Structures are given as structure tokens and as C-alpha cells.
Amino acid sequence: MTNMRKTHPLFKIINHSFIDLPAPSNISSWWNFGSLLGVCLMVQIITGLFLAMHY
Amino acid sequence: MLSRFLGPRYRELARNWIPTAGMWGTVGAVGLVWATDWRLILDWVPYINGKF
Amino acid sequence: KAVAFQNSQTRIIENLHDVAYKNALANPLYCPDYRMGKITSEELHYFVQNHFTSARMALVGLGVSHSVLKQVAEQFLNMRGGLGLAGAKAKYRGGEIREQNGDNLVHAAIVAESAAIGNAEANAFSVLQHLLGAGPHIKRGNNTTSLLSQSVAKGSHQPFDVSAFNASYSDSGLFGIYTISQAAAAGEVINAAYNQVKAVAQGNLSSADVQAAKNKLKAGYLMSVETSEGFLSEIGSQALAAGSYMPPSTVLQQIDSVADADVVKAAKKFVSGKKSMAASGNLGHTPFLDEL
Amino acid sequence: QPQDLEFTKLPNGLVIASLENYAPLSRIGLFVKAGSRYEDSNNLGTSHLLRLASSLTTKGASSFKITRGIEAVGGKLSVTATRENMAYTVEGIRSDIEILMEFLLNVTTAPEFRRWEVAALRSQLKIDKAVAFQNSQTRIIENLHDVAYKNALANPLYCPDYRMGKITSEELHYFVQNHFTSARMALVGLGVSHSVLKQVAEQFLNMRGGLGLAGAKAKYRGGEIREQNGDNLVHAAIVAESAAIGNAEANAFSVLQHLLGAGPHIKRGNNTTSLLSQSVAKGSHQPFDVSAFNASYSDSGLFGIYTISQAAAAGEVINAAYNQVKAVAQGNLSSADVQAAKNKLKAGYLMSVETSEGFLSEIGSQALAAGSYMPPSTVLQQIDSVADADVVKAAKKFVSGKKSMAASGNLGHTPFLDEL
Amino acid sequence: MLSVAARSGPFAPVLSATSRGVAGALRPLLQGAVPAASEPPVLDVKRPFLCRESLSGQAAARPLVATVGLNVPASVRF
Amino acid sequence: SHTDVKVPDFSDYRRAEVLDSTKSSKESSEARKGFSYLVTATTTVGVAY
Amino acid sequence: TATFAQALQSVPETQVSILDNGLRVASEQSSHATCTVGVWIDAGSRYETEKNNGAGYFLEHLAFKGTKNRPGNALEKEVESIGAHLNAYSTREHTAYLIKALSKDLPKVVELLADIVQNSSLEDSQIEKERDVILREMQENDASMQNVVFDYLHATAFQGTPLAQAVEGPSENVRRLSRTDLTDYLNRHYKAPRMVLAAAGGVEHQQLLDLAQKHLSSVSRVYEEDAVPGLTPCRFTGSEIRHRDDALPLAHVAIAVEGPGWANPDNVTLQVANAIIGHYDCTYGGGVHLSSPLASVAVANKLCQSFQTFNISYSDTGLLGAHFVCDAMSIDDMVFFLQGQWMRLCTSATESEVTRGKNILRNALVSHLDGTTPVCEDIGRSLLTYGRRIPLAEWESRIQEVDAQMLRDICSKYFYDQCPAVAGYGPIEQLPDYNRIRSGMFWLRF
Amino acid sequence: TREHTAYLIKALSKDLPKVVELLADIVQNSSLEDSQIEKERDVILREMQENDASMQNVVFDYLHATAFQGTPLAQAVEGPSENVRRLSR
Amino acid sequence: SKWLDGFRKWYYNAAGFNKLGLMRDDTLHETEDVKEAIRRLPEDLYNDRMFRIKRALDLTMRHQILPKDQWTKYEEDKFYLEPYLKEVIRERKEREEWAKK
Amino acid sequence: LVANLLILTWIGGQPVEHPFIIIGQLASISYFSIILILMPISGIIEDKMLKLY
Ligand SMILES: CCCCCCCCCCCCCCCCCC(=O)OC[C@H](COP(=O)(O)OCCN)OC(=O)CCCCCCCCCCCCCCCCC
Ligand code: HEM
16 A cells, blocks of 8 residues: 555645645734635636626 | 956956957847847938938 | 774773684674675575574474464474585684774783583683683672782772673683773783783682682572573573583582582693783783783 | 075974975975874874864964965865874975965964864764775775784774764864974975075964974784675785884885885786795786885884785685785895885985975975985995895894784785684 | 884885875875675664663573575574 | 677668768768758758748 | 065076987986886887787787897896896887886896897797787776776777777687787887987996997887888877766766867966865775865765866877766766866966966976986976977976966867867766756856 | 552562562652751652753653642642752652 | 843733743844754754744644743743854854954 | 725725825825835845844
């Protein structure tokens, strides 16, 4: 057997980025903000797609 | 804070690199003239005086 | 090999057998570093067909009847000749080896020739080995009945251990002193042990201590065969060495027949014999064979 | 004609020697009696790392300054080491000798010996020991010195594997402050005048004055060592004790090794005049080479035979060589062969002092040992003043003494010392 | 004839080791290279014996016997 | 041995200016790379146009 | 006091004289008690016609195995009677037999050399024995990967020409080697006008000239066919040989371009270029503070085991480049760095590097010429290649003419935008393709 | 161990009354003297210094310390060094 | 005079790293020169620096500080990286002035 | 600087009347001066003030 999270060629990127990424323990709430930006970005895209469906 | 770059070796390096940089600037100038069809230059070249 | 060489006793015993014999006993248990990656399967087939022959094997069973042993013996074992290759008689060499490897403790083994298995002097050498000391009996004791430990601790004040090393083979044997001492105190421990054995060789010993050594040897032999694996190992070793089974009471009464003059003779033979030394550690203060 | 070699004994014990060659390049070297003879068991391999620390940071010159300053002028800095002495030699153009002597004396007098630099250097000394042990003669001569001497010369040229990662800067400083003292320094210069060397020596090397820590006094133990490593060839070195340097018996042993065979003279030669080669060639039919080994130090020497032969025929080669030396010791030698050996020894010494670096090595060695220079004509006269009875006595001393045998290869047929 | 390394004829660079800190203009013969060799395995450290009671029993007294099991760890007795 | 290792003939592949093993190179080499870089140059002129 | 140019002026001049046979007798005198006397012959492996490829090497083998005047090992005994050293070598263009001896035996050694010039007995049993010895030492020389890479580079750089063939020749030529072809080679390649008798050390030119007039008179003087043998030029070929054998631990790669030759003076400038790059191996003690950028990068990134730069010259041709041994996992990177350094010398050679290279070249030129043997070698090869012994003062004058402008002009002439010859041996999978190397031989930024 | 103590003699069958007598008076009339108190005080200090280098013992002591926190099962058989420096008769 | 020292002490208290148990030399942003200075440190000072940085990160995670008796005082604030850093800058300047010539 | 950005945000929604021109000019001048000039000067000042150089 093997570890599917670390050996799959697609899941290795998600494991290296958002699962087993080493991060500082003492970062404050401001370090949330950029991730929120990414979420807000895709939110815009989703809403924009539906605003592209009737404009 | 670029006082590291004051010396005879850097001066000799820059002096060696003047003509290559000048030739590359000539290439960039000719490329910007040709790709934009600038009337300030092609009206002085004798052959290209047909489109203006 | 790298796991088994974590104990310095292993390396000292390997070097001691390498120096003590010219051939046929100086071959190591473990494979040398140059031979790794160069041992072929054809040599293994050659070794199997030349040494796994019929008259050199004993099948020993505990908890299993004799008839199925004979059926397995006639079924699986009867296609080999019996002799194979004989050997090279294990001639004695002598000398010394010193390994400067930088350890906290210095290990020194000084050995000489002894009796082989089956002679009348091998039991005397075992009695002498238990007289000089061949292992502790109390956890965190002081070894008052051990002559070597008492003689060394008469003049020493640092951690140490002295024992008597004994090994018996079919044709040759080895008997000597094993010392673990400090780096700067190795010479005192080695000289104290050697002077104690030289005092034993001149008849300066107590017959009560010989009786205690006989009791210790009988107790150790009887405790070596109480387990099933030790019993099987002793039966197989006796069947290979002599071809017949010896009951333990006969071994005990053979132990009891050892005289004190035999112990003095064994100590004198060790003192007068040629020496092989294996030393390892910080050997700036460890003495030499001609300086003893 | 260049000027004569000239000496000066300074009051701090330093011996400076200079010859004005009017050479295009000058070579200047400092010879220090600080070999591996002076290491006890607690500082093994200190001389090897001190040899490899010739470009570390010193006071007034860093590692970058030393390397970029010697490498810009084209000159070189090298250091050689026997078991008894070291030599730091620089060489370069005569217009660069001032900064070359400044770099040499800063390297050899006051090294800072920082911790991180020797921590970098220990991997380099491991690589150096691996490259040096790539051949076969070095390991067997190292084991021969391990078994031949019980102290003070069994310390090897190269650092042992257990000591790697364990030499600190403190014991390097301790070794330098004990054995780099001014009473055992010979500053020699070819191509530089005596005024420059004298003024630099008086201006800079008044830091230490003492005699230093000495008192090694190596002793002989004998014995044998066997290295089963499965090579198809078998190397063997069988030696015994012999007289020290600076004696008539040393010249007798040199005449004896040039009689018995002391290296080839002809490229792919048949070794016609070597007695050991004659005996083995009349005995064998395999490729081989047998030579005579002689290493004579200040207090003791080793003389013997060195054979490389086949694995299956090592015993006959070693027995033939030993029987040839036994025949020489009994008196079976002619005066023409002794005269040929004397001529070979004279030519060997004169070719050894041919080039400038070998000549400077000879200057530094004789300045350390004697404080002056014997001309080569006096050395040839000392060679010519040896009788053949001294050669017979040297061979008899080798035969009738206890032996040290180092062997390597497939030693199944290799005889032990009791069988010779 | 002093200079022991030069006195020994063929064994001149065997009895003496020469290195350099600054490379010369002349290229040395036999430049040489360390091949990529093997590495020893990493084993856990063992108990030291810095008192007299722990050294009790550590001295060898018997012929050395090795034992390799299949699912039993390999052991050795002195 | 390694001295047996011999390069075969390429005469069915070489250019006409380097077919002779007796005459030296470096006389017609500049002409050969001039032809090759002229091919490269006119291709780059075409794709730039 | 004295400066460097005055000290080079004080070096004694090499005296050259001629014979009626055409022999060139040259001598340099010093104050040494020893001397080196040798014979240099302009006959290497370039003069063979592919059916006698191992002929000169096999003559070098049989040259010391007896003559007609001194049959057998007694000749060897003569060389060991006086404590003399007898050495020889054979190249692709030269052959040399030299003896180191004292000065007092200076007559007889010349006579001994004369014997090896012109009375070499070739016994058939000696032919079979030396055939076995040649096969043994070719299979010994196969182990040394550096010589294999050298022979591979010569084979792939001069294909179809007499310069591709090795000095020792192929094995089959050693097997079928007769005596008649050796006699023909000795007759047509050991003539008097292609020989220099060179002496260095404690010699006198008049005594040596008298000895050459006595012993070395009438060597051949006759071509025996009225057919003078010459040397056609050898065509350089930009090509690539890759010997892949992954069982070896290390890989050796040599990259070369065509050199100018012997008489073309920019050789001296090219020497300075090599002196900028230099040599490095793992036993050095400079660390990251080495002056060469390639050596410093190789130390810092642990790239190469060793590298060297060479400028090998033959008659109007040669090789010019680098050779490095390294592990597989660095090979490509090393090539990149090496090519970068070459283009640096083609584009941005500074004055400090030129001064350092000039100092290194002065040190190498003088430090090579120590002792009688390299001086005698310099005399023999100088009279064979240039036709004259070039003095060290002329070398100093030639070095002083070099500034950075002509150095980068010469490097742009020889290195820039040229097809190299690549020879590889070992785990050379990561050795780049020839298109990548040829692309790396120029810069897009120039 | 953490909850058991054993004192055992292995001997022959003939010496059964003597080994019963030694096992009886060892656990009943053990003589303690202050010189012996300090002697095995330094001996147990050196034993603990030796046992610090066995990583399996250190890990199992850590596991017992962190799995049984605040209970008498967390403390080791040897105890800390301050107790063996301060235990008395 | 002493007023500048007292005002420096007030600014040292106002900076705030001493309330995390840090020293001044721990607060250096590690460039290549500072990295080589840390690489040249002895093992005990390196271990003390690593523990001080780890404790400061643990306190900054919890948004807390040490008690006022455990604050790093201005008197015993030993400047341990200054001589290693000074030699690193000096060697870098030597390399710089060699490369500029 | 942050409060100056807030001021510029407030001024940007105002017409070009008194006193918004002078306030906006002072705000932009202070914005460029704080970003370009005063922040490295303050960094050098605390570098001196902590005995860093
Ligand atoms: C004392 C407390 C009284 C009340 C008690 C209740 C508790 C309150 C909190 C007590 C805190 C105790 C001290 C602990 C905090 C740390 C120290 C501190 O903050 O001190 C106050 C500080 C001193 O300055 P500090 O940064 O420490 O050092 C400067 C070097 N001398 O001082 C400052 O930072 C003052 C900053 C003043 C800034 C004025 C700016 C004027 C100009 C603004 C222009 C902006 C807009 C520009 C627009 C342009 C275009 C129109
Ligand atoms: C690809 C993804 C996007 C699409 C398809 C998209 C599409 C649209 C469409 C169709 C409108 C006009 C609908 C309306 O406003 O009535 C709009 C308005 C707008 N979008 Fe997006 N948009 C996208 C991403 C974004 C992003 C990333 C932003 C910036 C955060 C953005 C900012 C705006 C704004 C400010 C308006 C004006 C809203 C208003 O009327 O007040 N959009 N978008």
C-alpha cells in the first residue's frame, strides 16, 4: 500500500499547498484576509456568470 | 547604496558593453519604427516613400 | 554485520581469533567488507554440496516421536555422501592486534592455547575459568569469590570488569583474561589480573575455592540445559562432537573428578604458553605482550 | 657562477640559510620539526589537519586575502610532511617575494584557527585520506609503521577515521605553541639575498623563543599485520630495525639497498643488476617486482624488502628474496657489484639534488639536523668510504633481528613470519 | 645524505605526504577523485558503562555465538 | 582495447566543402555557417513579416 | 639586485650546431654535476598508413632489449653500471630516447644512445614477448579513463586523417605485426635530418659535438627510395563520441575546439586563456576563495571532481579545450558553467584577469624548466617544432604584449561560434545533446 | 516495576533450605548503614546517568509521565535525582 | 550624558521585544550576513537563541507577554552577535573591494 | 499614512471648492513624503537609537 495524499500526482499539489504546508503558529487574523480575497474573487466570478446570463 | 559599482573593473565592463547595448538599442528603434509605420522616419528612407 | 558489531566484545573476539590462528579458525563469523557484493550463489551451492553431507548432521527432536524422525531422515536426507571436506587443523599463530578507535573503555583480551573438547584438561580449564571468575552471580555485586576481580580491586578505584575467557573446539582451544578498564588505568588492571593468574599457577590457591568453582560449574551446566532450547543445543552439540549422548549426572561426576593439581597445571600451561592479545580503545597506556 | 650558500644562527635558535642563485623565480621555505612524531594518543591526526590548514585566517591576512594574493601573483604555497618534520614552501617571481614571505610567515607563525574553518576543513581531510589511500603502497607502509614501532612513529601521516569530527581548534593551537618554536625552525631561501631573509626573520619571528615540547623516543615492537582484501596481487613488506640518520651504518644500509635493488633504472627494464630480481627471475615466471625499503629517521630506521607478486606465488617470491638477503649476509657478494651500488647511490643523490625543490628540501633538512650544509662532494666522499664488510654487517643485522611484516591481498599462500 | 624522503629512492612520496593550500601554475600529475562509495547504516546509540555495577557481566567468557531468527531479532552471545 | 574504437565514414552525409580529409577546415567553415544562418535569417524575416 | 627580465636575460643560451648528415646537435650548460642527453626523432603515429599503426610504439618497446653491439641485458647492465636512468616516450608526432646520467660518463652514454639509434636488433622471440607486453599494457591503459577520453577525442576530432589513430594502434595490428614492416619503419623514419641530439646540464658543446661526429656520424642520410615522407594537413571535424557504460562511478567529458598549431603566435595568448580558467581537483585547499570562477563555482555547488584545460598543438593543427571528471548528476550543469566562462573570455575579459593569467603563465613557463630533464625536453621539442630554441626572454617579451583586447579577440576567433568535439565516457546520460552544446558555444546577448 | 518487586534466587534442588533462609532474612533484617547509603546514592546517580542514554527507556518513561499525569503512576521507579540526593535511613 | 542613556532605556522598554523575553540581537532580520553570523555561533548560544525565538513565537500566538520580573532588562542584554557580525561585514567588504578593483 | 489615505478618500468625493484644494495638496504631499522620505529616515533613526550601527 501507499499514502494516496502524498503520492498522487494531482493530490500532491493540494497536500503541499493547503494540507501539509508548514505555516507560522503565531500569525494573527490579518493572515486570513488574502485567503478571503481569493474566496471573494471566485464569489465575484460566480455572481458575474449569472449576471452574464441575462445582460 | 550602489557604491559597490564604482571601480576600474566595472568601468571596463561597462565600456566593453557600450557597443552591444547601442546595437541592441538600434535594433529596438528599427523594430519600433517598422512595426508602427512612423511617418517621421520612413519618409526619409528613399525606397519606402510610396505609402505616404 | 553492522548491528552485530555494536558490541566491542564481538570485535575483540573476532580480532582475537584472527590473530590466534594461522588458518581454519581465524575465519570470521561475519562477512568482510570487501566480500560484500562479491559472494555468488555458485559458492553457496559449492558450500552446501561440500559441507551439508550425511555423516555430519544430527536431527534432534523434543516433543516428537522417533519413528517420524526416522521417516523424515530416510525421506529428505538420504542423498548425500557423508564426508565432504575435512579441514586444516587450525594451527596456532600468536601475536597481538591493537585497535585505536577512541572508546571510553579499553577492552583487552590476552589468550593462550588450552585443551580441546574431550581431553582431561578441558574440564580442568573450565574449573580454572570458574575459579578465576567467569560471570556475576548477584545483580550489582562485588565478586568477592572471584580472584581476578578481588586482585584488581585491591589496587584500583575506577569502574572495570575482569573475567576469564574460555573456548574449546574440536582440535584447539583458547583460554585467557578479558579486561574492560579505563583508558589511563588499563596497565594496572592487566598487570593485576596477570599477577593473580601467575600466583594461581604457583599453587597459591585454596581447595575450598576450587570446591566453590566446581559447584559453580555444575550449577552453570545444569542451568544451561533446563530450558528446551538449551537442552536441544546441548544434545545436538554432543551428537556432533562425540556421536553419543552423555547424561548430565555423568558430566557432573566428570566435573567432580578434577584434581587441584590439574587446575595448577592448567594455569601453568596458560602462563608458559605463547600469547595472543586483542586490544581496542585509547591504547596510550595499554601495555604490550613483551612488557608483561 | 652564483654566490655560495650562507648560514646564520639567530639567538632565538632560528637557523636561516640563503643562496643567491640569481634565479628568475625564488623558492623560500620554512622547515619545522613538528611532524607526527610528537602526537600522543589523545591528539591523533592533528598534524594532518595542521598540514591542511595552510590557507586559513591568520592575523593580518584572511583566507580570502591569502588565496587571492598568492593566486594573483602566480606563485604557490605548498606544505610537505614526513613523520618527523614539516615544510611550508612558497615559490614565485622575485618581485613578489616580499608578500610571499609575509604570507608564509603569517600562515606558519600565528594562525587564528577559528572553529567554523576547521569544521569546514574536516571533510576535506577525509577526502584527502581517501585519495591518498587509493593506491596500495601507502596503506601497507602505514600498517608497516603501525606494527614496526610501538610509540612515536606508529602515528600515521593521515588522520584516523575515528578522529574525524573530533579535532578541535584548541589542540591545533596547543600543537602549534608546543612544536612551532623558534629553536627548531630552518628558514631557507633560493633566489633571495641574506639581507631580506635576515631582516624579515629578525622583524617578525620573535614571538616564540623556547626549545619546545620534545622527547618522543620511538621504540621497536615488531610483529605482523594481514589485510585480506581480495586483490589478485599480493603486496608484502618485511623489515627490521636499523641504524638512525647521520651515521656510517646509514650509508652502509643505503649501499645495501642499492645493491639489493632500489627502484628501476630503465623504462620497462628487466632489472638485471638487482640481486633480488635476479633470484626471483631465476625462481619464477610471473610478473612481479621486488625492491629494498629503507627509512632511516633521527633515532631509528627500518630496512627490509618490499615485494609485489601474485596471490598464488607470493610465498616463493618472498622466500627467494629472503634467501637472497641471507646469501648476501653470509658474504656472497663481489666488489664490482658493491662499486656499482656505490655509483648508483652517488648518481641517485646527485639526481635528487638536481631540481630546485629537491635541493631546497635537502638544504632545509640538513639545516634542521646539523645547522650547516655539507657540500655534495663531501657526501660522495662519505659514500666512497664504505667497505663491503659494513654492507655484510648491515645485512647480518637485518637477518638476525626481529621482523615486522605487513601483507595485503589474497594471503592464502602468503607465509607468516615464523615460516621465513 | 639527510632528507629521509629523498634518501629513500622509490619510496619518496610514500613516506611523505605533500598537500597545497594554494594551487600551483604547474598542473599536478594524477589529479585523482573520490568515487561515490557506500555509507554505513544508522543505528541507535547504546548504553554507556560509567559505573562499576553496569560493567558487571560485560566481559566475555565463552565462544562467540551468533543467532539469526526469521521473525526474531538477530542476537549474539559472548 | 579502446584503440579499436574507430569512427566509420560519413561521406554519404557530409557537405561538399568538407568531403576531403586532406585539406584543412576553417577556410570554408565560415561559408557553411553563413549559409545556415542565412536560411535561419530569411525564415525569421518571413515570420516577423 | 635584479628584476625578472634581467634574471631571464642571465639564463644561458642554447648552443646549436649541425652535422654533415643533417643531425641537429644542441646543448644547454648549467652548473649541475648531472646531465640529460637525449635523441628526439620526428616520427610519431601520424606518419603511419593504417597498416603499421603500432610500429613506433613497438620500436620503443624493442629499443631497450639489446642491440647488435651489446646483445641483450648486458646493454641494460651498462646503463646500471654507471647509475644512469634510461627513459623513452612516443607521441603522435615525436619519439624520444633520453638518458639521465652524471657528467664524467658523458662520452659512453652518447655511444649508448647511438646504439639505440641505429643498431636495434629485432629478435623474433623478443617480438612475441613485446607483443604480449603491449597487449598487457593496453588492457592496463583501458582502466585509466583519462587516456581513453584523450584517445576518443583524437579519434572523433580528426576522423579519416592520420591524426585520429592512437599511438599504440589497434589490437589486431599488434597480433599480426611482422618484422619486415618494423625494418621498413626504421629505415624510412629514423633518418639523420629528422633527429636532434639534445644535452642539458653539466655538458660541453664542443665535447658533445665531437662525440656526435664520432658515434652519430652517417646515421642514414639516404631516403632509400628518393621519396621524402611528408605530412599533409589533418581536417578538424566537429563531432561527438559518447561511450555509455553506467557501471563506472564517475564520468569523464572532454570538450575541445580546433587549435592554431605550433608556429602561430596566438598560442601564447591562448595559454593565458587557460591560465584564467586553470585546473582544479578535490585535493586542493582553496575553498570558495579560488581565483578561477569555474573552480569557485565547482567548489561551491559541489559540481566536479576535477577539471583541467589543455592547449595541445601539432603541425598546423591542434586541440584547445577542457576535460572534467564528475558524477552523473552534475554533468550538464558543469558544461553550462564551462561554456559561460569561455564566452566571458569572448566578451568581457578584464585587465585584472589578464594580469593574473600572465603571472600564472610566467610561473608555469619558468617552473617547468627546472632540472636537466625538462630543459632537454624543451630543447628537443623546440628544435623539432619551431626549428629553434625559443629563449625565455622572448617568452617574457611575448607575454608582455598581451592585453585584454587581443585576448578577447583571439578567444572570439577560436572559441566563439565554433563546432566543438565532445568525448564522453561513463554515466553520461545527462551529458547534453550536441545541439545544446553548439547552442552553448555562443551567447544571444553576445 | 511500577507496582511489583521481586527478589529471586536460582540454585540447585539440594540448596533449597539455604536459599529460603537467605530470601527470608534479606526481606526482613536488611542492614542499612550511612556509608552504604551514600555509596549506592552515587551508584544510582551514575545508573540514572547511564539510563538517560537508552532512548526506549526515556520514551516509555515519557509515556508513563504524560499518560498518567498527576497520579502515582507517572513517577518512575528510579525517581528524580533530588530524592536520591535527599532520601535517608 | 546619562539623559541619553535613560531615554534609550525608555525606548528599549517602548520597543516591546524585551517583554517577550527576546534580546536585541534576536530581533535582527536575517540576511546572508546575519545567516553566516548565526552559522558561526557556538552551540549553546545558538540553542538559547532558538529557544528564545520559539518562546517569543509561543507568546505572540497567545497574544500574551511574560510577567514583569521575567522581562529582559536593559542592563544584562548581552550583545552576542556583534563580533561575529562585525567580522562577517569586514570579510564581505574585503571581497567587495577586491572585486571592485 | 493610513489616516492620510482616509483623508484622500474623503477629499476625492468632494468638489474643487474651499478648502478642499489645499487640504488635498497637503494630503498628497504628505503621502508621497511619508512613503518616500520619512520612513527610511525613521528606520535609520531607530537603527542609531538601538545602537545597531
Ligand atoms: C499617558 C497616558 C495617559 C492616560 C492614561 C490611560 C492609559 C493610556 C495608555 C497608556 C500607555 C502607557 C505607555 C505604554 C505604551 C507604549 C509607549 C507609547 O505609546 O508612548 C506614547 C508615544 C511615545 O512615542 P514612542 O513611539 O514611544 O517613541 C517615540 C520616540 N520618543 O507617543 C505617541 O505615540 C504620540 C504620537 C502623537 C502623534 C501626533 C501627530 C500629529 C500630526 C498628525 C497629522 C496627521 C494628518 C496629516 C494630514 C495632512 C494633510 C491635511
Ligand atoms: C469573470 C467574472 C465576472 C463577470 C462575468 C462579471 C460580469 C459582470 C456583469 C455582467 C456586470 C454588469 C451587471 C450589473 O452590474 O448590473 C458586472 C458588474 C460589475 N462588476 Fe463584474 N464580473 C466579474 C468579475 C468581477 C470582479 C472580479 C469584480 C471586482 C471585484 C467585478 C466588479 C464589478 C462591478 C463593480 C460592477 C458594477 C456593479 C454595479 O452595477 O454597480 N466583477 N460584472
